[PDB]
Symmetry: C3
Subunit: 124 residues, 3 copies
Amino acid sequence: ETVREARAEAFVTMRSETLAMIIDGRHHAGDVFATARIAGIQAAKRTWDLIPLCHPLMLSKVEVNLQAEPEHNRVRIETLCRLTGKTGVEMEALTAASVAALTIYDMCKAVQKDMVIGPVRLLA
Amino acid sequence: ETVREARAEAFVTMRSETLAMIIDGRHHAGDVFATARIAGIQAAKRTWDLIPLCHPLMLSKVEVNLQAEPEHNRVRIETLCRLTGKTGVEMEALTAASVAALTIYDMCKAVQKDMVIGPVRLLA
Amino acid sequence: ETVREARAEAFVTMRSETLAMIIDGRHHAGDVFATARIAGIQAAKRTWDLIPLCHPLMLSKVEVNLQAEPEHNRVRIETLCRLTGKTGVEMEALTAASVAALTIYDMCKAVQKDMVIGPVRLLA
Ligand SMILES: Nc1nc2c(c(=O)[nH]1)N[C@H]1N2[C@@H]2O[C@H](COP(=O)(O)OP(=O)(O)OP(=O)(O)O)[C@@]1(O)[C@H]2O
Ligand SMILES: Nc1nc2c(c(=O)[nH]1)N[C@H]1N2[C@@H]2O[C@H](COP(=O)(O)OP(=O)(O)OP(=O)(O)O)[C@@]1(O)[C@H]2O
Ligand SMILES: Nc1nc2c(c(=O)[nH]1)N[C@H]1N2[C@@H]2O[C@H](COP(=O)(O)OP(=O)(O)OP(=O)(O)O)[C@@]1(O)[C@H]2O
């Protein structure tokens, strides 16, 4: 039994107006980043129930951080998962990143029909 | 890693007729107290999934006890949660008490529109 | 804290045509056995949430195996559950077997109205 951790990233690519709306609605009720962070945290804790062969685990830590990248017309999501145990937490990190990305998508899709999620991958 | 425990209480205040109906339907199919106890136990085990920042834990014990207080026109709910681990179980105890209270409410609301839940708090 | 395990079996009895359809659709998209295995695995991990008094546990292993028994006009399901902990996994094994059986039933019920599930029991 050891300390295990994993980090993942995801991106959501969108038009400039769409990203500007996220930036302008930040820190207000309906905060896209706040909502996506909570969604990702909740999703990480449910990973065992979403991915058939994953084991139930006791996550002691899940972090989801989001940043606008206006220069690339996209949002970057980075996640961190940690626990002390025998099973790793790669899928928790990826699932948290993915559901955070889907939540950004959900909150922007009225404005834009052709957003793209990706890449979604582990960080070294 | 130690033995951790928490106790909570909740109250549901109602008219005398409403409480009398609970007392009279006790030990029969549709037992309000039996249903509320099971709801509270189930809710305690799901606390991590209801409260965003709570950690998943392995509850080894959850107890929910209910008593009519005819003298005060109310039901009192007391809960107990225990486990051996590194994280406490205050939220499990409060959530079990709260959902037990909501279940009493649900089973009585046809009869009464203005029941009040509270206080809900930890016990020392 | 020790290694704990449990094994269960379940049977679904059906007409010969119904069983033949399962055998003939095996290894194809809509594989009844593949679907039932995944359902049973997922169900085992949720046992604590289905059975009110069961404890949440960290299952390290769940196996679900299915075999056609043409000679008896039935499907046999055998399950295995294991973990290292203080609480046994009998209910996880039985629940995995039961939900696997219900999934076989679901996937065959258009064809047959009078299938029977049982026995469902622990193995020694
Ligand atoms: N929650 C959660 N669970 C996880 C992962 C995760 O990131 N998060 N990674 C691992 N894990 C689940 O188990 C896989 C690894 O298999 P395992 O080594 O536990 O199987 P064993 O019991 O050793 O036996 P074999 O099956 O190896 O023979 C796996 O790749 C998942 O399927
Ligand atoms: N199921 C469940 N979970 C619970 C509680 C509960 O009653 N029941 N209480 C605790 N806990 C969750 O974690 C909170 C306490 O934070 P923590 O001390 O674990 O965080 P750490 O990993 O130490 O890092 P920081 O974030 O402290 O820097 C908390 O207050 C909950 O948010
Ligand atoms: N997931 C899951 N959980 C399980 C089982 C299972 O197969 N799978 N078997 C056990 N268990 C739940 O706990 C029952 C056994 O009770 P227990 O010995 O834990 O209670 P204690 O805390 O010792 O106190 P008392 O209540 O004994 O006084 C039980 O029979 C279940 O109710």
